[PDB]
DNA sequence: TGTCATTG
RNA sequence: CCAAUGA
DNA sequence: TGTCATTG
RNA sequence: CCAAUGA
């Protein structure tokens, strides 16, 4: 007596008593049944698979040439919708993707609270391997594993592994396991406080990424085929007297006298040596355009081309990524040659929708301010709260004891020391990086961390905490476990120490930018009566008018990219600033710098 | 090099150049691809199959988890839509059904001109066998028969015979044959004038029946379970001194002295004999409720039960029918017993939607008026144009030479003679029917048809026309072929003669009621801003508010049933009268009598 | 591949 | 009588 | 299952 | 230096 399915749409008494039962349920699972048409090699959504306890699934379908139950999309769209008083926690496996396909097939704008188990078991152990439905079942909810023998999926929902088994069967089996497993995950997240952040940061952020993935990013093939010639034409320049792999550039041709070639870090007096410029430009027309101008998609509804990124997460730090052609990795603008300069990059081939401007918002010295908070460094806090240049002023402040109004441009080497200490690199490599001596660098380190005595007493505190705990937790309490902090090998433990400091600092940075993106979105879908993403317009208005409002476009770790209409681009920037500057209330003022333009090779206001 | 399919949605250049090509096409075929989900034993629409020449099909699909082409329903709904200047002739095989399923799955309210080949080849030869896609191919367009070998469907569209073959393949094969065949059918309909009536009566009427089939008819199980007891309780009454098949009622029990029993047509002085009342009531609780209360369907969107009839057509006369429980065949109201009377029928268990009233419109002596037109019977025409009682006045007029103001109730036997002559039954059976003598009946016939000399000279004219032609054509020119009018056997030829008169008279009746229903609908969907059938509300508003307007509910040969809202039930009745009374301009005034009530056991205004 | 009912 | 069902 | 580039 | 890709 194992696993029962209830074909809900198979009657009328059964269906109307079903949604009655359903419309007073707070928690319940959901799983799309997606089957392939005979090939016509296209997939299609053919049924929900709602469950809310035990081994009992309620399979909705989308019903053979009938005249009753033709309001089937209405019933789902009406149940998958917050309606004040109580909103529902809807556990969905590949939630990010599910949300998309649930819209780009049948115009259902899922508007509830969500609880993905795939990200719940990540949050438990961020150094875990990418969790499958199988893996989740194998660990949590050990029994009901026999329901997977023959299913054979190690990636996404039962939809994503469509194999012989009917859409309804697996969709039902998903909902059962997904529901009952998430209940055990919720129990563990509760045990270590992570349920609060999972529900009010990590899942809300997942929903934010879903919106971003639907929107995508504008891409001008025109202004990309511009750089395709600007770079290639100014590639083979003044080259008097065949570039290949490694063994090619002989130093026995001219005149330190080793091999490698990568470290051509002189080129000052000895010859022109314009090799690094060629090496960059060539490697910046191949990891940017030629893999990307193949994923470009003409979207005639918008009347432009766009690319559709796939957010990653499941990152040990907490920073969000993208698969394939990752738009985070396109190189920023830089000069060339012709005496006369020009500025190039593929960041000029990323465009707003016609009549709009792209909006960037960087946090500017966020990881610094996090350490300033955690490390109760008296003057380090007070230097940041003044709103003065946080490197001009930090140079004086106490490092060089006095200057304040005239303190040169040793700020450029004042930050180099600052970041060099928090990055946790040895005096040797820092000294080689600044262009000074290993000794005099070690002197500058000690003469900085003494003048800001908080930094070093913080690191020694958090490393000893990590040694006794076996893990370190960020400012939102998300733990990362490190077994290397016990290791006998000095290098391995030393590596574990600078792993611990990184995750508690630039993980807490990932935490604030999450809280920032969700608090923005909540505040963003209010004043603007014209509703949400490009998906909820090409898809939801397609089954439920100018382009007012702004949409989430790109996540750059500590920087956010939005795409706003020029009409109301000023009313949004206030929403972005005020929300990011108040995301978390710290002992240090969170400042942000916003830039507005026709790409993201643009100036500021 | 045979049969090419173009997966149109497989690109973007291909798709956008496709609908560009399409949006300037006047004629083109269409065929729904309908595949079954694994069982979840429900069918689903998965693609159009547009074609417009040769062996080249353009297969639309409804596309795998993508972000471009998610406006797919819009593109069809926008192409399947008249847009002024030019409207498109859309050839669809099982058009009546196709239209329904094209709406009760994906909210596409097909709004073009239509050309069904299944009804085009009926119109050619109404005594033909029910035409299949195979049969249409076998006769017209003899080649491309090999495209059917393995398909094996002998009923409906390639959808309706879903078997192993992919929805796209057969849907494409349909569109090719359907298009190219209909072109040959259009050529034959042109050759004999029938293309004009096919396009402006027969197909428009088919569309009218589609609307009716979507609407259905209200059915109160409450007021049906009323008669279920009223009839059954007043069934076994005063029965002093075991009813079975035939051999049971012996006349050797009491006291003309044969068998049969069916002809208990005395029961006057000899005993009560209340056997015909029991025989009727029992056979009127079994061919009306017990086969029908099983096809009743709760439709919660309307908040009532309804039944969904399936119109027939392909009738030698031209009158439209319904399959299964045919609502045309429910017996009208009649009295019973308790001294004290009550009136019963199942026509009291057919109801309007809450807040509405049912509207009936009978043509009253239509077949008479058709004969009055065709047979140029001078006074017969003039008797009908006065608007006086057309049987009180017809009794005098000339039959009894004079009376006019006092002419008794021999009108009841004046019409009996009238209908008896046009029905074409012998003096024998008419005489037995009126309760007079075969001789004195034959006298009354000759003394009527002499006083109205048109009737007999018309019949002798049209029978000699039919003898030389091999067929007779109605007032709209729809031919019916009769090989029996040559037959040596006197009975067979005599039968063929009264077949000829019937079809030219009560076929021309089917023609006017068609023209009536289409001219009503055209005038009906105008003033009423709130749009069309119950299908275009539970289905089209479901993918494109009170219940103002009126909808086509039942076709009773010469009578139409509508279902109108009480708010504006007076504004519609004017539309129905004026349209039916002007359907065709004859030499005789077409009068109509309308009845309004809470069922169709109701009174008039 | 008969005969009787119901509706028009 | 004719046309649709129906025993 | 190495080393060099890009982004933060 | 750490984390994501990438030769
Ligand atoms: N051949 C034939 N035609 C009929 C018969 N009954 C009606 N019709 C045709 C010709 C006139 C027209 C009237 O249809 P209705 O049944 O609405 O009218 P009725 O008042 O019941 O019939 P009638 O006019 O014979 O008195 O339909 C019938 O029994 N046989
Ligand atoms: N470990 C590490 N963290 C970095 C690195 N670059 C940036 N971060 C983190 C810490 C500060 C923050 C700044 O990100 P951005 O790249 O936007 O800032 P930047 O001005 O380019 O860098 P920086 O502050 O080091 O001068 O992100 C890096 O190379 N290593």
């Amino acid at each position: 007596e194992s696993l029962s399915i209830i074909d809900v749409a198979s009657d009328q008494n059964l269906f109307q008593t079903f949604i009655k039962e359903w419309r007073c349920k707070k928690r319940f699972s959901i799983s799309l049944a997606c089957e392939k048409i005979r090939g016509g090699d296209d997939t299609l959504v053919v049924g929900l698979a709602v469950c809310w306890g035990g081994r009992d699934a309620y399979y909705f379908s989308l019903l053979d040439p009938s005249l009753t139950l033709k309001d089937r999309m209405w019933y789902l769209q009406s149940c998958l919708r917050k309606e004040s008083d109580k909103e529902c926690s809807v556990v969905i496996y590949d939630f990010i993707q599910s949300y998309k396909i649930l819209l780009l097939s049948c115009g259902i704008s899922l508007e509830q609270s969500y609880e993905d188990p795939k990200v719940a078991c990540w949050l438990l152990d961020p150094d875990s391997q990418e969790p499958t439905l199988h893996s989740i079942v194998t660990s949590f909810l050990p029994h009901e594993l026999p329901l997977l023998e023959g299913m054979e999926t190690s990636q996404g929902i039962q939809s994503l592994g469509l194999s012989e088994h009917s859409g309804r069967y697996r969709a039902s089996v998903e909902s059962i396991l997904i529901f009952n497993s998430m209940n055990q995950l919720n129990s563990l997240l509760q045990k270590e406080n992570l349920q609060d952040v999972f529900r009010k940061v990590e899942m809300p952020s997942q929903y934010c990424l879903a919106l971003l993935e639907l929107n995508g990013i504008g891409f001008s093939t025109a202004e990309c085929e511009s750089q395709k010639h600007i770079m290639q034409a100014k590639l083979d320049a003044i080259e008097t007297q065949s570039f290949t792999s490694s063994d090619d550039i002989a130093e026995v041709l001219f005149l330190s006298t080793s091999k490698d070639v990568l470290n051509k870090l002189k080129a000052l007096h000895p010859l022109p040596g314009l090799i690094l410029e060629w090496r960059r430009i060539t490697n910046a027309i191949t990891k940017v355009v030629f893999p990307l101008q193949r994923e470009k998609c003409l979207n005639p509804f918008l009347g432009m081309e766009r690319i559709y990124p796939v957010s990653q997460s499941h990152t040990a730090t907490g920073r969000i990524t993208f698969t394939e052609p990752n738009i985070q990795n396109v190189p920023r603008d830089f000069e060339i040659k012709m005496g006369m300069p020009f500025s190039i990059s593929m960041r000029h081939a990323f465009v707003p929708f016609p009549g709009g401007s792209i909006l960037a918002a960087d946090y500017s010295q966020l990881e610094l301010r996090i350490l300033a908070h955690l490390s109760h460094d008296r003057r380090l806090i007070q230097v940041l709260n003044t709103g003065a240049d946080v490197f001009r002023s930090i140079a004086a402040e106490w490092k060089m004891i006095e200057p304040e109004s005239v303190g040169d441009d040793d700020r450029q080497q004042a930050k180099q020391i600052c970041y060099g200490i928090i990055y946790g690199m040895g005096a040797k490599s820092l000294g080689e990086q600044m262009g000074i001596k290993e000794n005099d660098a070690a002197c500058y380190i000690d003469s900085f961390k003494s003048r800001y005595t908080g930094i070093n007493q913080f690191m020694t505190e958090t490393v000893k905490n990590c040694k006794r705990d076996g893990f370190v937790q960020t400012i939102l309490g998300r733990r990362r476990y490190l077994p290397g902090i016990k290791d006998n090998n000095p290098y391995r433990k030393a590596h574990a120490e600078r792993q611990a400091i990184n995750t508690i600092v630039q993980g807490s940075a990932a935490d604030i930018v999450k809280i920032a993106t969700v608090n923005i979105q909540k505040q963003l879908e209010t004043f603007h009566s014209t509703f949400k993403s490009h998906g909820h317009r090409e898809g939801m208005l397609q089954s439920d008018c100018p382009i007012r409002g702004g949409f989430f476009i790109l996540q750059l770790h500590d920087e956010l990219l939005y795409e706003v209409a020029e009409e109301d681009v000023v009313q949004v920037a206030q929403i972005v600033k005020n929300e990011m500057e108040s995301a978390v209330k710290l002992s240090v003022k969170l400042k942000v710098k916003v830039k507005i333009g026709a790409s993201w090779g643009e100036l500021k206001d």
Side-chain angles (χ1 to χ4, degrees), chain A residues 1-254 256-396 398-401 403 405 407 409-605:
Chain A
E1 294 161 299
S2 170
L3 186 267
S4 71
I5 301 170
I6 314 300
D7 293 338
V8 148
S10 193
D11 201 340
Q12 262 292 145
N13 321 335
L14 192 41
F15 183 91
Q16 284 294 339
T17 51
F18 160 72
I19 84 160
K20 180 213 71 67
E21 258 291 312
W22 193 15
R23 279 170 156 286
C24 70
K25 288 310 176 66
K26 196 268 174 62
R27 306 204 56 246
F28 59 88
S29 61
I30 273 180
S31 49
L32 274 51
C34 297
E35 290 201 19
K36 261 196 175 294
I37 307 158
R38 301 199 171 282
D41 196 55
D42 323 52
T43 90
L44 217 162
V45 278
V46 303
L48 256 290
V50 187
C51 161
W52 50 56
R55 271 175 283 183
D56 202 287
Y58 298 83
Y59 183 70
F60 208 122
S61 189
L62 310 92
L63 285 152
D64 76 296
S66 83
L67 304 97
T68 188
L69 242 181
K70 211 263 140 173
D71 317 65
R72 320 126 300 166
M73 282 188 203
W74 186 97
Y75 280 125
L76 285 174
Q77 185 74 297
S78 296
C79 287
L80 306 194
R81 182 64 58 96
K82 163 179 171 68
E83 219 76 40
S84 313
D85 180 38
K86 167 184 67 65
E87 61 78 17
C88 305
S89 86
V90 185
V91 315
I92 311 152
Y93 177 57
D94 206 330
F95 160 73
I96 327 96
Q97 198 190 10
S98 282
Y99 190 107
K100 300 170 81 180
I101 183 59
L102 224 187
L103 187 74
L104 287 334
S105 308
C106 41
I108 281 78
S109 176
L110 185 33
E111 278 185 42
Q112 294 283 10
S113 63
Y114 319 118
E115 288 186 350
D116 186 334
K118 199 171 48 57
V119 323
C121 67
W122 161 82
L123 208 159
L124 286 182
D125 182 28
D127 284 317
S128 63
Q129 193 163 200
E130 187 65 46
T132 56
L133 188 275
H134 183 290
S135 67
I136 285 175
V137 159
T138 323
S139 49
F140 331 101
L141 219 72
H143 281 172
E144 306 299 324
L145 191 270
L147 293 184
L148 269 42
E149 308 307 74
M151 308 294 258
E152 305 288 353
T153 318
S154 60
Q155 26 178 17
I157 51 179
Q158 296 298 164
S159 109
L160 194 135
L162 88 94
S163 180
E164 212 167 56
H165 300 164
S166 53
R168 75 185 281 275
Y169 180 40
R170 55 182 157 75
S172 302
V173 172
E174 188 176 314
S175 59
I176 302 313
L177 302 159
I178 290 308
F179 178 83
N180 287 263
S181 293
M182 253 304 305
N183 284 250
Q184 277 176 349
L185 290 175
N186 265 137
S187 84
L188 296 180
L189 296 171
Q190 273 181 29
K191 261 194 61 170
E192 319 168 28
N193 300 39
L194 285 340
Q195 194 195 226
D196 302 61
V197 57
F198 169 70
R199 284 171 54 265
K200 301 309 177 192
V201 174
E202 213 66 36
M203 281 310 314
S205 65
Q206 267 291 41
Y207 151 61
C208 289
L209 282 175
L211 249 64
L212 185 153
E213 283 185 342
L214 295 176
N215 289 306
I217 180 51
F219 175 88
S220 172
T221 295
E223 205 161 23
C224 200
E225 216 203 357
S226 181
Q227 266 78 341
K228 191 163 175 283
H229 293 78
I230 296 304
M231 296 171 86
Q232 196 75 240
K234 295 288 172 291
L235 186 66
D236 300 311
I238 178 64
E239 310 179 337
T240 60
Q241 200 94 9
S242 58
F243 315 87
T244 57
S245 181
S246 300
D247 294 310
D248 44 13
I249 312 314
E251 295 212 62
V252 301
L253 309 170
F254 32 96
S256 54
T257 50
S258 69
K259 306 178 178 180
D260 303 348
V261 185
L262 270 300
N263 65 310
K264 210 290 180 63
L265 314 177
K266 184 53 174 290
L268 258 68
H269 193 285
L271 302 177
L274 38 61
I275 32 69
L276 293 193
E277 189 161 25
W278 190 98
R279 293 280 268 279
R280 271 224 302 176
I281 297 161
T282 293
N283 284 63
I285 66 158
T286 321
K287 204 203 164 185
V288 277
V289 52
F290 190 78
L292 189 45
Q293 78 180 169
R294 321 218 90 76
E295 265 188 354
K296 66 184 196 171
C297 310
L298 173 51
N299 185 283
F301 187 50
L302 293 160
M304 68 188 304
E305 299 185 25
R306 271 182 172 260
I307 82 161
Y308 294 105
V310 187
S311 78
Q312 176 42 53
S313 311
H314 196 84
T315 65
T317 30
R319 316 229 81 109
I320 82 95
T321 298
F322 297 95
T323 70
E324 274 291 290
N326 184 345
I327 313 311
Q328 298 176 320
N329 289 10
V330 301
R332 44 188 147 75
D333 312 354
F334 48 72
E335 64 163 11
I336 39 167
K337 79 298 173 179
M338 274 128 270
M340 180 165 53
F342 259 18
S343 184
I344 59 159
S345 171
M346 279 57 61
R347 292 199 187 186
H348 305 105
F350 287 78
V351 294
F353 63 83
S357 285
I358 290 179
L359 201 298
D362 195 357
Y363 251 100
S364 60
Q365 310 117 42
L366 196 266
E367 286 81 344
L368 252 289
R369 287 159 197 283
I370 293 177
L371 218 170
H373 172 85
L374 292 174
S375 188
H376 308 88
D377 190 309
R378 298 222 200 110
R379 63 171 61 84
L380 174 58
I381 289 171
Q382 298 287 9
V383 165
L384 278 40
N385 299 357
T386 50
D389 183 344
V390 194
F391 281 127
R392 168 52 226 255
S393 71
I394 222 173
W398 203 265
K399 168 47 158 34
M400 297 314 200
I401 296 184
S405 292
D409 297 26
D410 72 326
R411 57 170 283 200
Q412 176 51 41
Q413 73 163 217
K415 72 184 280 283
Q416 274 175 176
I417 300 293
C418 193
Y419 283 109
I421 295 158
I422 76 178
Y423 284 21
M425 50 177 170
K428 42 110 173 176
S429 57
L430 166 62
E432 292 163 45
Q433 190 145 39
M434 299 176 59
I436 67 176
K437 206 55 57 199
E438 172 177 331
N439 289 39
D440 288 31
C443 185
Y444 276 33
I445 288 164
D446 279 62
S447 76
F448 186 89
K449 73 154 54 176
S450 55
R451 282 39 190 277
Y452 299 118
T453 180
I455 306 303
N456 65 103
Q457 65 180 127
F458 156 80
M459 290 157 61
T460 48
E461 174 65 17
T462 62
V463 78
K464 210 66 193 285
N465 290 179
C466 177
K467 201 178 183 178
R468 66 155 158 241
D469 277 304
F471 59 83
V472 56
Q473 56 189 240
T474 69
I475 64 175
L476 285 195
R478 183 182 59 269
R479 302 180 187 185
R480 178 174 171 172
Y481 304 86
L482 300 165
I485 214 80
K486 284 211 209 86
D487 197 339
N488 284 46
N489 183 309
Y491 152 78
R492 298 286 294 112
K493 155 131 51 51
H495 177 40
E497 295 184 8
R498 49 177 152 271
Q499 277 191 168
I501 62 95
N502 188 71
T503 64
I504 202 184
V505 171
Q506 73 165 200
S508 294
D511 296 1
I512 286 166
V513 72
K514 298 285 193 61
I515 289 172
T517 40
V518 311
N519 290 358
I520 279 170
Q521 270 297 335
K522 271 181 63 65
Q523 194 67 18
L524 193 56
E525 63 202 38
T526 57
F527 207 113
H528 301 86
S529 301
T530 299
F531 285 113
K532 307 163 52 61
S533 58
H534 290 300
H536 304 134
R537 186 172 128 82
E538 199 181 0
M540 194 212 63
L541 176 58
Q542 210 255 190
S543 290
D544 62 329
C545 299
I547 328 170
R548 284 177 290 177
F551 325 88
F552 191 21
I553 257 64
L554 243 179
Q555 213 282 337
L556 273 303
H557 315 96
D558 288 60
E559 179 182 48
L560 300 178
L561 267 184
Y562 293 139
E563 191 190 55
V564 194
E566 192 73 4
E567 187 221 55
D568 54 354
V569 71
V570 63
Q571 198 264 318
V572 57
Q574 298 169 357
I575 311 175
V576 186
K577 177 171 187 287
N578 291 139
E579 222 65 23
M580 284 166 69
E581 291 196 327
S582 60
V584 186
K585 206 50 53 195
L586 291 186
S587 53
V588 289
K589 289 159 69 177
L590 261 50
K591 279 197 169 57
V592 307
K593 278 85 187 299
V594 307
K595 298 186 281 187
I596 334 171
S599 186
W600 66 315
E602 35 72 53
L603 219 60
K604 66 181 175 63
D605 192 331

